[PDB]
Amino acid sequence: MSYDVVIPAAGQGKRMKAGRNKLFIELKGDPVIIHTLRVFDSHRQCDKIILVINEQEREHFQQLLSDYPFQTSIELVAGGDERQHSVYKGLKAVKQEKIVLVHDGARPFIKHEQIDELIAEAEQTGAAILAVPVKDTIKRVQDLQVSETIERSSLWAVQTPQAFRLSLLMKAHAEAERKGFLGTDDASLVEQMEGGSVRVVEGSYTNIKLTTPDDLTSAEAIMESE
Amino acid sequence: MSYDVVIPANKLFIELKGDPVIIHTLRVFDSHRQCDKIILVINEQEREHFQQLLSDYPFQTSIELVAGGDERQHSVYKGLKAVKQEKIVLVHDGARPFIKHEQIDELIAEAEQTGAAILAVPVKDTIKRVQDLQVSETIERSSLWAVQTPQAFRLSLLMKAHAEAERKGFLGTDDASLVEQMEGGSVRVVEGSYTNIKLTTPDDLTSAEAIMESE
Numbered sequence A: 001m002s003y004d005v006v007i008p009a010a011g012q013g014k015r016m017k018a019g020r021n022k023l024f025i026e027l028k029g030d031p032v033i034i035h036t037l038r039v040f041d042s043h044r045q046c047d048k049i050i051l052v053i054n055e056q057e058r059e060h061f062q063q064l065l066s067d068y069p070f071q072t073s074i075e076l077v078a079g080g081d082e083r084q085h086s087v088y089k090g091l092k093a094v095k096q097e098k099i100v101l102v103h104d105g106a107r108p109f110i111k112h113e114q115i116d117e118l119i120a121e122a123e124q125t126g127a128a129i130l131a132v133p134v135k136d137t138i139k140r141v142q143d144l145q146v147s148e149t150i151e152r153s154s155l156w157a158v159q160t161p162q163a164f165r166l167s168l169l170m171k172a173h174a175e176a177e178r179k180g181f182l183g184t185d186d187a188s189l190v191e192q193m194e195g196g197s198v199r200v201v202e203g204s205y206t207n208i209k210l211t212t213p214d215d216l217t218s219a220e221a222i223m224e225s226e
Numbered sequence B: 001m002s003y004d005v006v007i008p009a010n011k012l013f014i015e016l017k018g019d020p021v022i023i024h025t026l027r028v029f030d031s032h033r034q035c036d037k038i039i040l041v042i043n044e045q046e047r048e049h050f051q052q053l054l055s056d057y058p059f060q061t062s063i064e065l066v067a068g069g070d071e072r073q074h075s076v077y078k079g080l081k082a083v084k085q086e087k088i089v090l091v092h093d094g095a096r097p098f099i100k101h102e103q104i105d106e107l108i109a110e111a112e113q114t115g116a117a118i119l120a121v122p123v124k125d126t127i128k129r130v131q132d133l134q135v136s137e138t139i140e141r142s143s144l145w146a147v148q149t150p151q152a153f154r155l156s157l158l159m160k161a162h163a164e165a166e167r168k169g170f171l172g173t174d175d176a177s178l179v180e181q182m183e184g185g186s187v188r189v190v191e192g193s194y195t196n197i198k199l200t201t202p203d204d205l206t207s208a209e210a211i212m213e214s215e
């Protein structure tokens, strides 16, 4: 029942345009990454947190973490140039075979309820993601000019966490690294493997990712609402 | 220079800070000098409910209620028959109240220059096709855009588009699809704003309230 969580936090936050890691931005007085860490530190089934960071920020994370009452162990692991590389470095720090969750540092509003439903699906079938139905029309665009329209009734917008049996995720990462496949999520690595299957748990539209400046306004309102 | 806007219709009476979302949306087109007419397409049996709304919220810009078919595509078509001469027509979701005139002008500017346009933003999330709560494929993310409204077209061009799409069986999801599908159909894309959100659910209202107070 017990899991480890790998939290990629090693990005620069270029689209957020804060002039520093977006994850140090304060929401209601506490950095984004502190909100995210708190969800896992307060969740009884989380044994360990592996937080993947840019090595230049390590002393800053050391300080930052010492100011807060985290009781669960938090290991700082250096990341890489892309999220996938960062995730793989974090996963190599997990010590025993078990269920592992990978969760973006930039999603601070994940709830214990959804974490619970994912771990259950991963335990049964191996690989589970949070997701929500797409509501907008999606099209592909070449040089600000439409090339085609994707059918939407079956389309879903994927969230984190994504939950996996460690062995299965490590195998997906190792194959992807050897072949040069760079996926945008951990699920797509598993999908690329022969016989790879991923299941969907419906998530909350409040589990937003903080990516652009307008996402900070949505974030403040979600906080105030709860 | 000047456009009509067709708005196809109830969820639109959901409120945002005291007023139905449709009234916030109407205000934007009413405050825009290049908007000559607003055509609001409705179910014929709700004509009184709408008359009442428009009585309570007087607008200076001309607003015409028109009877609407059983689907958005048919409603938009019915709406377009109420446009009286050749010009740019917008088609806009009533539940998108935060459209800015700046974006509206770019949409027109492009659809006069080249015939058809849409507002859109880059997709931020990974998108998967899912069948029975099991992933079937991941859609390649890189050149993906989330489409908003309004969508702006030369009337002849779009009514032409509705004409041929009527002639085949083709039911569309939005209207830009009708342009892209027949002929050598070209739709340019104007990068919109992530604030141009659609309001249906109560989580949506939570965001909308925040956007309003922010600006």
Ligand SMILES: Nc1ccn([C@@H]2O[C@H](COP(=O)(O)OP(=O)(O)OP(=O)(O)O)[C@@H](O)[C@H]2O)c(=O)n1
Pocket: A007, A008, A009, A010, A011, A012, A013, A014, A015, A016, A022, A023, A052, A079, A080, A081, A082, A083, A084, A086, A087, A104, A105, A106, A107, A209, A210, A211
């Ligand atoms: N090389 C990277 C890039 C991203 N991430 C992390 O992966 C999560 C999702 O990535 P994204 O939202 O793109 O964050 P950034 O890459 O930092 O932002 P941008 O793409 O706008 O630079 C973030 O918590 C980010 O810190 C990471 O650990 N290593």
Ligand SMILES: [Mg+2]
Pocket: A011
């Ligand atoms: Mg990134």
